[PDB]
Design a protein around this ligand. Structure first.
Ligand SMILES: CN(C)[C@H]1CCN(C(=O)[C@H](CNC(=O)c2ccc(Cl)s2)NS(=O)(=O)c2cccc(N3CCCCC3=O)c2OC(F)F)C1
Ligand SMILES: [Ca+2]
Lengths: 234, 53
């Protein structure tokens, strides 16, 4: 996260971290329930094997909230293509259930029409992760968050050097140097409603990070709600 | 505006119009209250709530 604030105790409890064989965090995720994590499809070939860590707010020190979970099944969307990052969504089935506690709680899955009428029409959403703090900088040791306004879809398309599909939306700022970045990838974009946070997007990609005239690009979760619900039966 | 358009039909979470009337519902981990609007957690750490406790 470029700019923004760091998540305080209990503020971003749906944050998950995908860690590799070397124990390095390489992508984010969102807790949906005791067994399921929402993440980006593109994150699943940046390692040969990975695990999920929850309750982490500081990668350089250990903390009471933390627990590791192994993935039983990886449900990557069969239409994902790295040329466009279209269909950039995947669901992880954990072997053992998450225990919800301080810094560990799922984000709510919204209903399709309500989300489009009520959540997408809010001024801003919130995005978090351990990703880069500058476009060319290193990964953050601390979990950061950032309030990002929803961007008009036409303005979004006119800004982009690459295709914006029906499975994507824009969020962030025009010139203000605040945005998600590499490593936040696959992490939570949530929207607040009456003191409750609903998962509205997945950190997918952008033309660098925090660039003027460029926004963050997020996988539109509302286009995949039935698909996600179907994933959580098997 | 009308119904769900007017203040989410007084529902805590989801609102959809049904037989003119409004019907409220809640996400997993909650149950609808007796008033048919509020969403009450069924245990600690319900979805969407910042875990300040
Ligand atoms: C696995 N790592 C290395 C990749 C994963 C996606 N990446 C990028 O989008 C990078 C860095 N920016 C970001 O990650 C984000 C910025 C804002 C949000 Cl939201 S995510 N921006 S980028 O410029 O350097 C970039 C690097 C690799 C690939 C891309 N993409 C994204 C999909 C569309 C075609 C493409 O080349 C790409 O974006 C493109 F617009 F330039 C890094
Ligand atoms: Ca830690």
């Amino acid at each position: 996260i470029v700019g923004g604030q760091e998540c305080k105790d209990g503020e971003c409890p749906w944050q998950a971290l995908l860690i590799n064989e070397e124990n390095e965090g390489f992508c984010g995720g969102t807790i949906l329930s005791e067994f399921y994590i929402l993440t980006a499809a593109h994150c699943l070939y940046q390692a040969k094997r990975f695990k999920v860590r929850v309750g982490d707010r500081n990668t350089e020190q250990e903390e009471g909230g933390e627990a590791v979970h192994e993935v039983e099944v990886v449900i990557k969307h069969n239409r994902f293509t790295k040329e466009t990052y279209d269909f950039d969504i995947a669901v992880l089935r954990l072997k053992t259930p998450i225990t919800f506690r301080m810094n560990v709680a799922p984000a709510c899955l919204p209903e399709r029409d309500w989300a489009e009428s009520t959540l997408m029409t809010q001024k801003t959403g919130i995005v978090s992760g351990f990703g880069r703090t500058h476009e060319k900088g290193r990964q953050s040791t601390r979990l950061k968050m950032l309030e990002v306004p929803y961007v008009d879809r036409n303005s979004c398309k006119l800004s982009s050097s690459f295709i914006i599909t029906q499975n994507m939306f824009c969020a962030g700022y025009d010139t203000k140097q605040e945005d998600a970045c590499q490593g936040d990838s696959g992490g939570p974009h949530v929207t607040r409603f009456k003191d409750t946070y609903f998962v509205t997007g997945i950190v997918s990609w952008g033309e660098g990070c925090a660039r003027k005239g460029k926004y963050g690009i997020y996988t539109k979760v509302t286009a995949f709600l039935k698909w996600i619900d179907r994933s959580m039966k098997t | 505006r009308k119904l769900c358009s007017l203040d989410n039909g007084d529902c805590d979470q989801f609102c959809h119009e049904e037989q003119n009337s409004v019907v409220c519902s809640c996400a997993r981990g909650y149950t609808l209250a007796d008033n048919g609007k509020a969403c009450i957690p069924t245990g600690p750490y319900p979805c969407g709530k910042q875990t300040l406790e």
